[PDB]
Amino acid sequence: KPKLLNKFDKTIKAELDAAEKLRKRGKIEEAVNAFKELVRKYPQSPRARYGKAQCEDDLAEKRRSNEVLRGAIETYQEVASLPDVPADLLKLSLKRRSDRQQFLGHMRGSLLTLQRLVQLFPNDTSLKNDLGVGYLLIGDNDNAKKVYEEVLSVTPNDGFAKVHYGFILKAQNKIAESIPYLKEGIESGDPGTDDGRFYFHLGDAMQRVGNKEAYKWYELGHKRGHFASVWQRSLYNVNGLKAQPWWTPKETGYTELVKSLERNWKLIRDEGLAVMDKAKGLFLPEDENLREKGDWSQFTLWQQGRRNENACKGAPKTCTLLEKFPETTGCRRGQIKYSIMHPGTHVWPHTGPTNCRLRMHLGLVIPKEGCKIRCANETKTWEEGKVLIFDDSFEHEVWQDASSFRLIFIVDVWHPELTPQQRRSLPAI
């Protein structure tokens, strides 16, 4: 049981116990008054300051106000600034500060605290694991890697450090090397290893190298509640939405959008071809490591429900056409983009991040033979001027072995069963 009272705090343990009792009884405002009282009378007390912070934390929870929680984050810092802080209290205070900073999305502030924590407690392996997460959350995987390498150099069977090292390795396309770390880390059962991300990426890594045990892990990930199914492995889901790999226009209810796309398809094609000829740079190579081989680039008009105005200069009539359909232009979990794929291209089996969107494919330039897309267990072909619709949260795969290029138009839509407030509130992806 942690030691939180320095020498002077024990002399006033009565008052501090009484203030804490008010907080644990739920009488939150009484408790802040008591702790602010103690903070004034004993301005150097770490426990009184910690109490003020905790009560501000509880109060933000009750009020659900980021407002209040930002205050608690500064008080947690005030605690560490005081003299003669017990080590247990110093660690509790700065950890909760980092955690709440992450809860608010202040990832660079959380990282700063984590770095401080590691310097103060250099033998705590758990804090270096937490520091690696802080790096990953800001997209600094280089430093995250070194952190977990050091953790493994001292405690080489740390499961948490294993999965996160494997995750980093896999993201850098070191697929074979990633597998033992991800696998051994999931099997350790350590806290923080039962996470869908690691099942998702171990299975994918195994699929890429031909290891047939991959669905062994998709199975277990489904049993442990990370995947809705073994075929649909998205991780940012609204549970309950109808799940099937392929849809018809009527099944989605977006029949006006589909009609508009198919009736005006030559216009959409021509503006894409014009960009290919006179503005090649607007097409950007796919940068998610989804290709085994080949050339594949996309020209994006909407992403996260935001129109790219420079991009729409190149497809002005197409953008004007789409503005009439908020079900796609307001889909903050999807994109609207041209997609070109050239012969000799194979896209790995992969899954999208969310089940909250459906993906439409309008055929623009489709060679007679060589192009096909599998989703789940049904494989289909594109047609010039016709729309395919599939739920890309299911595993899907694509080939291109024609003798010329293949151009399609991709239009993501909210899953139809999502409510207007869900569509307005769910975080963008």
Partner: peptide, 18 residues
């Protein structure tokens, strides 16, 4: 880095508290 077609980032969203 954003998750557009795949799930390769450690987290795909930005959090905003309550």
């Amino acid at each position: 880095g954003k998750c557009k077609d795949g799930l390769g980032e450690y987290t795909c969203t930005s959090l905003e508290g309550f």
